[PDB]
Amino acid sequence: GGLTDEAALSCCSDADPSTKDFLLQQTMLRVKDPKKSLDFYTRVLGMTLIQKCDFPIMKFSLYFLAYEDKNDIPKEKDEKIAWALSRKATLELTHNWGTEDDETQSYHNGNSDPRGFGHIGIAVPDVYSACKRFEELGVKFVKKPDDGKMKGLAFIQDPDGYWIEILNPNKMATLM
Amino acid sequence: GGLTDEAALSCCSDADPSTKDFLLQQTMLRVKDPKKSLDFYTRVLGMTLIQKCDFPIMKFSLYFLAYEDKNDIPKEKDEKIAWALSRKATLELTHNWGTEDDETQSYHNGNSDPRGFGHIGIAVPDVYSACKRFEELGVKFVKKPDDGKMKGLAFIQDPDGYWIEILNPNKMATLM
Ligand SMILES: N[C@@H](CCC(=O)N[C@@H](CS[C@@H](O)N(O)c1ccc(I)cc1)C(=O)NCC(=O)O)C(=O)O
Ligand SMILES: N[C@@H](CCC(=O)N[C@@H](CS[C@@H](O)N(O)c1ccc(I)cc1)C(=O)NCC(=O)O)C(=O)O
Ligand SMILES: [Zn+2]
Ligand SMILES: [Zn+2]
């Protein structure tokens, strides 16, 4: 079986005071073609590009996306970086230059061997209307809301095949 | 080369009004042994276990961790699930029952072929003092702050080998 509630709680320690201002800032995914990824995360999911970083010597670019208002992005370069990297829950897309033209390359989504990472998840007001719009836009589904084992939640895929869960927090209580 | 700023902006669309309340709620990682993972995320990183879910029929448990105050967790079951799954920036650890006793099993961190997912990142007030405490606790480092190419940021590993970046948002402006 799994851990009992009691055993799980027994493995948890209270937070040391030196970790009090820590925050979960980002999740990083590698993307083959940033033009496709930027269109997907902004047009389909409504995220905002808050910061683009280029490192010519190492041949890669980074794209930070988040659910933030465009009007809150600072104009000054140094303030912009400090603000972008101190937002909670950002998505960092890494583009290693050249992958978009290489037919033998692709990234692995973690859901087939060898497994590891599973998904990112977006909380929405209504899974059914959000998925109706996704179907209208031609988005590829891993799991429609009424398919699979757990009903009421969905999995879509981004341009690289990463899985994105679509969930409504106020309808999850009957799954357990 | 990579995308110019102008070309990147050209691939972004304004957010459709039906995505206005969407939020980036979780990142899911599979963990071999939840006892080790819970101790690492709570004792080393100071996160709080906000919700534990067990699915006996499918043989797995889910552990949601976040930088949230323990006193804000609702007491009622249904309110607790709605609150936990509407927090931004949570970490979902999936335990498939039995992996902790299987010597031939382990998860892949995404940083060696086949690559995909890279890391989660934690923003802290001071990278050097946080890493000093991590060293005192026996945490395994992928990259100490002054090693590697980008100075001032670190990468530590959790019990499964997943990479966790330690960064100070106010010291990143000179890297570009
Ligand atoms: N054996 C699986 C175990 C994990 C698992 O099965 N996760 C669920 C989504 S719950 C999840 O990811 N999530 O965020 C969540 C957490 C708590 C609740 I309550 C509801 C949803 C899944 O993929 N279901 C497919 C289906 O139902 O057909 C694995 O390794 O991925
Ligand atoms: N070829 C690489 C490209 C991505 C990459 O190299 N990322 C950096 C951390 S920046 C990153 O992950 N992050 O959040 C970040 C973003 C913007 C800034 I400004 C600073 C840090 C890395 O791993 N450096 C190792 C080293 O320096 O030795 C890859 O595929 O992983
Ligand atoms: Zn990063
Ligand atoms: Zn999930």
β-bridge pairing B154-157 and B163-167: antiparallel
Residue A1's alpha-carbon distances to A22, B61, B103, in angstroms, are 33, 9, 18
Measured distance CA(B12)–CA(B26) in Å, rounded: 23
CA B153–ligand 2 middle distance (angstroms): 9
Strand order in the sheet with B90-96: A141-143, A154-157, A163-167, A117-123, B23-30, B90-96, B60-66, B48-55
Rg (CA), chain A: 19
Q: Which of residues 24-43 of B touch A (CB under 8 A)?
A: 24-30, 34-35, 38-39, 42-43
Measured distance CA(B39)–CA(B28) in Å, rounded: 18
CATH classification of the domain holding A6: 3.10.180.10
β-sheet bridge partners, residue A119? A163, B28
DSSP string, B21-83: T-EEEEEEEE-S-HHHHHHIIIIIT--EEEEEEEETTTTEEEEEEES--GGGS-SSHHHHHHH
β-bridge pairing A23-30 and A60-66: unpaired
DSSP state of B116: B
Name the 3-class secondary structure at B118. Answer: strand
Q: Angle at Cα B161 formed by Cα B160 and Cα B165, nearest 5°?
A: 125
Containing H/E element for A9? helix A5-10
β-bridge pairing B141-143 and B154-157: antiparallel
CA atoms lying within 13 Å on the CB side of residue B118: 16
User: Which amino acid is located at B75 in the chain?
Assistant: K
- Give the distance, in angstroms, between the CA of residue A28 and the centroid of all CA atoms in the same chain: 8
Containing H/E element for B156? strand B154-157
Tokens 């937002």 belong to residue: A87
B171 φ/ψ angles, rounded to the nearest 5 degrees:
-125, 15
**A136 is a catalytic site residue:** no
CA B42, A93, A41, A143 torsion-angle sign:
negative
**In contact, A11 and B34? CB cutoff 8 Å:** yes
DSSP state of A67: S
Respond yes or no on whether the N-terminal peptide bond of residue B125 is cis (omega within 30° of 0).
no
CA A33–ligand 3 middle distance (angstroms): 18
Determine contact: A75 vs chain B, CB below 8 A.
Answer: no
CA atoms lying within 13 Å on the CB side of residue B155: 16
**In contact, B91 and B121? CB cutoff 8 Å:** no
Measured distance CA(B51)–CA(B32) in Å, rounded: 19
Respond yes or no on whether the N-terminal peptide bond of residue A114 is cis (omega within 30° of 0).
yes
Task: Give which of B27, B32, B26 is closest to B159, Cα–Cα.
Answer: B32
DSSP state of A42: I
**In contact, B57 and B25? CB cutoff 8 Å:** no
Q: Which residues line ligand 2 (CB under 6 A)?
A: A 26, 28, 30, 53, 58, 60, 62, 81, 92, 94, 96; B 118, 121, 143, 148-150, 153, 165, 167, 172, 175-176
- Most ligand 1 atoms within 8 A of CB, residue of A120, A153, A156, A174 to mutate: A153
Atom 11 of ligand 2, nearest CA residue: B165
Residue B165's alpha-carbon distances to B39, B64, B128, B138, B152, in angstroms, are 18, 19, 13, 17, 11
Q: Which residue of B has its CA nearest to A84?
A: B169
Measured distance CA(A117)–CA(A107) in Å, rounded: 12
**Number of structural domains found in chain B:** 1
Identify the residue among B21, B22, B73 best suited for mutation to test binding to A, counting A beta carbons within 10 A and taking the highest. Answer: B22
What lies within 8 Å, CB to CB, of A149 at 6+ separation is B58
Residue A88's alpha-carbon distances to A9, A125, A175, B93, B121, in angstroms, are 26, 20, 28, 19, 10
User: Quick one: tokens of B49?
Assistant: 């276990």
Ligand of minimum distance to the alpha carbon of A118: 1
Pocket flag, ligand 1, residue A150 (CB < 6 Å): yes
DSSP string, A104-122: T---B-SSSSSP-EEEEEE
**In contact, B83 and B73? CB cutoff 8 Å:** yes
User: Quick one: tokens of B128?
Assistant: 């050097």
Chain B positions in Cβ-Cβ contact with residue A38 (cut-off 8 Å): 8, 11-12
**In contact, A64 and A28? CB cutoff 8 Å:** no
CA B105, B110, B115, B116 torsion-angle sign:
positive
Identify the residue among A22, A97, A112 best suited for mutation to test binding to B, counting B beta carbons within 10 A and taking the highest. Answer: A22
Determine contact: B91 vs chain A, CB below 8 A.
Answer: yes
- The angstrom resolution of this structure is 2.0
β-bridge pairing A90-96 and A163-167: unpaired
Measured distance CA(A112)–CA(B105) in Å, rounded: 14
What lies within 8 Å, CB to CB, of B138 at 6+ separation is none
β-bridge pairing B154-157 and B48-55: unpaired
Measured distance CA(A95)–CA(B103) in Å, rounded: 35
Determine contact: B140 vs chain A, CB below 8 A.
Answer: no
Please report, to the nearest 10 degrees, the dihedral formed by the alpha carbons of residues B95, B96, B102, B103 taken in order: -60
Range of the domain at B46: 1-176
Task: Give which of A159, A69, A55 is closest to A97, Cα–Cα.
Answer: A55
Atom 18 of ligand 2, nearest CA residue: B172
User: Which amino acid is located at B7 in the chain?
Assistant: A
